[PDB]
Each structure stands twice: as C-alpha cells, then as structure tokens.
Enzyme design. Structure first.
Site, PDB file in Angstrom:
ATOM      1  CG  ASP A 201      -1.885   1.179   1.233  1.00  0.00           C
ATOM      2  OD1 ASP A 201      -2.145   1.780   0.168  1.00  0.00           O
ATOM      3  OD2 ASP A 201      -2.399   1.505   2.324  1.00  0.00           O
TER       4      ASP A 201
ATOM      5  CG  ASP B  35      -3.712   4.526  -2.605  1.00  0.00           C
ATOM      6  OD1 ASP B  35      -2.988   3.625  -2.140  1.00  0.00           O
ATOM      7  OD2 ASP B  35      -4.792   4.858  -2.086  1.00  0.00           O
TER       8      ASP B  35
HETATM    9  N1  LIG Z   1      -4.642   3.117   0.198  1.00  0.00           N
HETATM   10  C1  LIG Z   1      -5.463   2.572   1.110  1.00  0.00           C
HETATM   11  N2  LIG Z   1      -5.116   1.648   2.002  1.00  0.00           N
HETATM   12  C2  LIG Z   1      -6.284   1.329   2.902  1.00  0.00           C
HETATM   13  C3  LIG Z   1      -7.376   2.199   2.344  1.00  0.00           C
HETATM   14  O1  LIG Z   1      -6.762   2.955   1.240  1.00  0.00           O
HETATM   15  C4  LIG Z   1      -6.634  -0.167   2.832  1.00  0.00           C
HETATM   16  C5  LIG Z   1      -6.971  -0.738   1.602  1.00  0.00           C
HETATM   17  C6  LIG Z   1      -7.317  -2.094   1.503  1.00  0.00           C
HETATM   18  C7  LIG Z   1      -7.658  -2.635   0.255  1.00  0.00           C
HETATM   19  C8  LIG Z   1      -8.907  -3.213   0.048  1.00  0.00           C
HETATM   20  C9  LIG Z   1      -9.209  -3.713  -1.221  1.00  0.00           C
HETATM   21  C10 LIG Z   1      -8.271  -3.643  -2.252  1.00  0.00           C
HETATM   22  N3  LIG Z   1      -7.093  -3.087  -2.042  1.00  0.00           N
HETATM   23  C11 LIG Z   1      -6.768  -2.594  -0.836  1.00  0.00           C
HETATM   24  F1  LIG Z   1      -5.546  -2.068  -0.699  1.00  0.00           F
HETATM   25  C12 LIG Z   1      -7.292  -2.878   2.651  1.00  0.00           C
HETATM   26  C13 LIG Z   1      -6.946  -2.315   3.884  1.00  0.00           C
HETATM   27  C14 LIG Z   1      -6.626  -0.968   3.989  1.00  0.00           C
HETATM   28  O2  LIG Z   1      -6.274  -0.494   5.223  1.00  0.00           O
HETATM   29  C15 LIG Z   1      -5.848   0.799   5.347  1.00  0.00           C
HETATM   30  C16 LIG Z   1      -5.848   1.730   4.314  1.00  0.00           C
HETATM   31  C17 LIG Z   1      -5.405   3.032   4.580  1.00  0.00           C
HETATM   32  C18 LIG Z   1      -4.976   3.401   5.864  1.00  0.00           C
HETATM   33  C19 LIG Z   1      -4.521   4.694   6.202  1.00  0.00           C
HETATM   34  C20 LIG Z   1      -4.103   4.986   7.507  1.00  0.00           C
HETATM   35  C21 LIG Z   1      -3.670   6.237   7.926  1.00  0.00           C
HETATM   36  C22 LIG Z   1      -3.085   7.023   6.758  1.00  0.00           C
HETATM   37  O3  LIG Z   1      -3.997   7.063   5.636  1.00  0.00           O
HETATM   38  C23 LIG Z   1      -4.473   5.736   5.266  1.00  0.00           C
HETATM   39  N4  LIG Z   1      -4.993   2.457   6.820  1.00  0.00           N
HETATM   40  C24 LIG Z   1      -5.410   1.204   6.587  1.00  0.00           C
HETATM   41  F2  LIG Z   1      -5.395   0.309   7.585  1.00  0.00           F
END
Ligand SMILES: NC1=N[C@@]2(CO1)c1cc(-c3cccnc3F)ccc1Oc1c2cc(C2=CCCOC2)nc1F
EC number: 3.4.23.46
Length: 371
Positions: free
Chosen positions: A34, A220
């Site tokens: 990510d 992203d």
């Molecule tokens: N870029 C992005 N990451 C996600 C949401 O957007 C995230 C995406 C997913 C996800 C779901 C489906 C497909 N692809 C993914 F990456 C899963 C968990 C998740 O979990 C988190 C995410 C973002 C964040 C953030 C935390 C603080 C800073 O800003 C983002 N934290 C997560 F735990």
C-alpha cells in the site's frame, strides 16, 4: 533483479500482496502492498478470515514498545500494539532489518473474507504514520539499515488471480517499453503529485487545473479505482457519456451502482474513449501525459460484464490500480519523483495501447496545486 520479478499476487479487487517474514525463527505472512499509507501492521490474533497471524510469543527477537495504536481510516479500522522485530522479504533484497510492527488486536472491515493476506505494508512517508511521524515506516528502516537504494518500483499486471512485481531498491528495464517520464513528489507524505491537464479522447476537459488536485492527487496501490474530485468526476463522466453515446447505459452504471454486459468476446472497446492525465514534468513549463484505455477503467466482474471503475472522491484524485496497471511506476524517493513508463504487461488491443508521451508545453503548472 530477476528474483523479485513476479513477487506480487492477489485476487481481483482485494489488492496486491508480497510474501514477508517476521520474527526469529521467521514467520511467513502475505502482506498487502500500500503506497497510500505508512504503517507495517499484521494480524496477531486468530481472526476467522486469517490464514495465519503473527505470534509474538514464538519470536526471540520481538521487542515490545509498550504502546497502543488506533487507526481508523475511511473504509475501516484497526487497532494494535506496537513493537519491533526482524523482518525480511524472501523475494526481495537479501537482507534482514529491525522494523516497527503493529500487532493488530482488533479490527473492523480491514481483513477481507476470502483474501490471502494477513497484514499491510505502508510504503508512504512518516508524516502519515500512526500514531505520529516518530514511528519510522518500514522502507525508511530498510534504507537506513542496509545499502538498499532509496527507491522501489511497481508493475501491477492485473489478471481471477492478479500478479505483478515489486522491485525493491531498483528498476528492472524489462518490465517497461519506451522511456520513463518523471513527475515531482510535491510533498513527502502520501506520494503526492500534480495533474496539470485532463483529456478524454484528446479533448481537454477545460477545468481550472486546481480542481484536478483538490485537495491532493496521489499514487496509491491500495485503491482499486481511479478516484476523481466530485466536480472533475462530473465533467469526465459527461465527456465519457458523450464519447460512448453509440450505446446507452443507465445512470447507475456511471455511479458504479450496476454492471453492463455483452456477449462473451464482443465487448465494444472501440466505442469507449482513452483518458489522458498530464502530469507536472521535471522542467519549468514542461509536462508529459499518461493515457489509459477502457481495458483499464472497465473492470470485469465474473456474457462478459463490467463495472465502471472511475468514481467520485472527497479526498482528491487517487491514481489507483486502474491507473497503475497501465504503467511501470518508479517511486524514486531518492530524487523526490515518480516515474511512469508503458508497462510490458498492460492489457490492450490491436488498435490502442496505454501510452506515456512528452514533452508538452504547459504553463502555470504551479497554480494547479491546492494550498
Ligand atoms: N490506500 C489505502 N489503504 C487502505 C485504504 O486505502 C486499505 C486498503 C485495503 C484494500 C482493500 C481492497 C483492495 N485493495 C486494498 F488495498 C485494505 C486495507 C486498507 O487499510 C488501510 C488503508 C489506509 C490506511 C490509512 C491509515 C492512515 C493514513 O492514511 C491511510 N490504513 C489502513 F489500515
């Protein structure tokens, strides 16, 4: 970097993951890659969705930081306990580093039912790390403790199972064609960039370019769609509707509320327009453009059916998988820039291909950034 090629896997819509190890002896986990966050956080309890989880009791090199962390984000949340341990990437550089790890102990809508990953690897900068910027992100630790160069590159290939490559510490020139073109990283927090122009089938949307980056634009890997600020989405859909008006579709299709189908193998790609984003270049008044196909922004949902994978946003432009699957993307942290080149694995047809082209003359590009 032959050993790192094809080191990413996934399922459609569930993200891309890489194999990692944590602890001594090493515990293998699959970890979501990510570029839109900055924490390394792993399942540490037997959630029913999880294939496996970090067992700190089995690691001799585990160190407790005796501090909790609470991480709500827009679509879910996790909470956990901070510590450090030894971390390696089997299909990455041959090194082991001591990194911060959040042991996830409670979550909601974070883990996906049926996915094959158990944690998240935030590759963005310390400014957006939780609880604060004192929690050194993984990649920062990797570069600080080893001779791995301060860059990584992603080739996300899409499909259903998906695959790709994360080249850690370098660039593999076999993964792209043509030249890399670089856009500056505006600020080191997210991988923030500046879009200076938008065209649909070569036709300028003609918006004040600030609208394209209100309140930011980011690259992203953790978002599936191309997300656009509301006003920009409005204008883009209007133009995409007009370009594709051979066939007519329900209003809900453009809002992602329902699918559209055709007889297998007869999808009319040709009626859908290409989308071009011009990005701030490396030189004053110079830009370049990246162009994606409907093969990128019409996502299969398994007659061949599709979802419209461009959507509206209140958090700025997000260049997610819809954009990244067109390109080899170089996160050149050392030079505060992001490179784009046509991906050698992107999906296209006999008539059109994704493109990265330049240089173009674009004035007032600094006014495009939101303050
Ligand atoms: N870029 C992005 N990451 C996600 C949401 O957007 C995230 C995406 C997913 C996800 C779901 C489906 C497909 N692809 C993914 F990456 C899963 C968990 C998740 O979990 C988190 C995410 C973002 C964040 C953030 C935390 C603080 C800073 O800003 C983002 N934290 C997560 F735990």
């Amino acid at each position: 970097f032959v050993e790192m090629v094809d080191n990413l896997r996934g399922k459609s819509g569930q993200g891309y993951y890489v194999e990692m190890t944590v602890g001594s002896p090493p515990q293998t986990l699959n970890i979501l890659v990510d570029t839109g966050s900055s924490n390394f956080a792993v399942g540490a309890a037997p959630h029913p969705f999880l294939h496996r989880y970090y067992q700190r009791q089995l690691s001799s090199t585990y160190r407790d930081l005796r501090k909790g962390v609470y991480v709500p984000y827009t679509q879910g949340k996790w909470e956990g306990e901070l510590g450090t341990d030894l971390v390696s990437i089997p299909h990455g550089p041959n090194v082991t580093v001591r990194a911060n790890i959040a042991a996830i102990t409670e979550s909601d809508k974070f883990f996906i039912n049926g996915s094959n990953w158990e944690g998240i690897l935030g590759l963005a900068y310390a400014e957006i790390a939780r609880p604060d910027d004192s929690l050194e992100p993984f990649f920062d630790s990797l570069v600080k403790q080893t001779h791995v160069p301060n860059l990584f590159s992603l080739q996300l290939c899409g499909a259903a199972s998906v695959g790709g490559s994360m080249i850690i510490g370098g660039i593999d020139h076999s993964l792209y064609t043509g030249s890399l073109w670089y856009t500056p990283i505006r600020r080191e927090w997210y991988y923030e960039v500046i879009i200076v122009r938008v065209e649909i089938n070569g036709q300028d949307l003609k918006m004040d370019c600030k609208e394209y980056n209100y309140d930011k634009s980011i690259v992203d890997s953790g978002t599936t769609n191309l997300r656009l600020p509301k006003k920009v989405f409005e204008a883009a859909v209007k133009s995409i509707k007009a370009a594709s008006s051979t066939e007519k579709f329900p209003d809900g299709f453009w809002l992602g509320e329902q699918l559209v189908c055709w007889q297998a193998g007869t999808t009319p790609w040709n009626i859908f327009p290409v989308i071009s984003l011009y990005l701030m270049g490396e030189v004053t008044n110079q830009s370049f453009r990246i162009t994606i196909l409907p093969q990128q922004y019409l996502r299969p949902v398994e007659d061949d059916c599709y979802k419209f994978a461009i959507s509206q946003s209140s958090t700025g432009t997000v260049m997610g998988a819809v954009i990244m699957e067109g390109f080899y993307v170089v996160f050149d942290r050392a030079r505060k820039r992001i490179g784009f080149a046509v991906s050698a694995c992107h999906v296209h047809d006999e008539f059109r291909t994704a493109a990265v082209e330049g240089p173009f003359v674009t004035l007032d590009m600094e006014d495009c950034g939101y303050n």
